[PDB]
Design a protein around this ligand. Structure first.
Ligand SMILES: [Zn+2]
Ligand SMILES: [Zn+2]
Length: 230
């Protein structure tokens, strides 16, 4: 029952419960003449919520906040953007104005700046090298190396064994790596291997777009990227 594009009009956000205190958020957005669904994550931390990624735009992200208040009723106090693209940081100004402390790596903040995207307020240090991992509230943040972009981070929720791959991970139905303008195709499969080695216990893997699955999303991603590179 995971929602797809045809079930979410642009401007609306759905939440989907993955585990106790862990949800994905699903939004839709038009980009270059096509509508795409996009995922982020919500993780409970006591009486507060940690948000992973915006809902791809200001209006979507305002809707996201409204849907969180309706469905969950706990305040979002911090947010992390997992790379510099607009499906990840677009809506950060809305979050900030709402009183949410927004975060990203220094590299993500610099690339967002260069690209004219919204820029999270606070820098996440300790994630500059492939294999680096840091605790951030109820999650672990991991930099696997360059993949979909050079700055992409993944997020693990230890209490639930849930791995959110963001766009470094592709859904099982995918036949291609999608938008690779900022990608490092030579490194990507290695980056995926690092994730596989570091989170062998992951039970649910959530891609940046499309359906969640099991650990096979990781190998599938490496295979697609390799096949794409050719
Ligand atoms: Zn992207
Ligand atoms: Zn994306």
């Amino acid at each position: 029952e995971y929602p797809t594009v045809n079930e979410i009009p642009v401007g609306e956000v759905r939440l989907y419960q993955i585990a106790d205190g862990v949800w994905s958020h699903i939004a839709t957005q038009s980009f270059d003449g096509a509508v795409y669904p996009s995922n982020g994550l919500i993780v409970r931390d006591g009486d507060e919520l940690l948000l992973i990624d915006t809902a791809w735009g200001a209006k979507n992200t305002a809707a996201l906040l409204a849907e969180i208040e309706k469905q969950i009723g706990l305040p979002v106090t911090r947010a992390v953007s997992t790379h510099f693209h607009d499906d990840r940081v677009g809506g950060v100004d809305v979050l900030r104005a709402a009183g949410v402390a927004t975060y990203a790596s220094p590299s993500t903040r610099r690339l967002a700046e260069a690209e004219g995207n919204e820029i999270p307020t606070h820098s996440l240090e300790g994630l500059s090298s492939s294999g680096d991992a840091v605790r951030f509230g109820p999650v672990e943040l991991f930099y696997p190396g360059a993949a979909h972009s050079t700055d992409n981070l993944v997020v693990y929720v230890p209490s639930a064994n849930v791995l959110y791959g963001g766009c470094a991970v592709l859904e099982l139905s995918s036949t291609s790596a999608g938008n690779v303008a900022d990608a490092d195709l030579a490194e990507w499969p290695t980056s995926v291997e690092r994730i596989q080695k570091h989170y062998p216990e992951a039970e649910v893997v959530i891609p940046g777009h499309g359906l969640p699955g099991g650990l096979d999303l990781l190998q599938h991603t490496a295979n697609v990227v390799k096949a794409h590179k050719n």
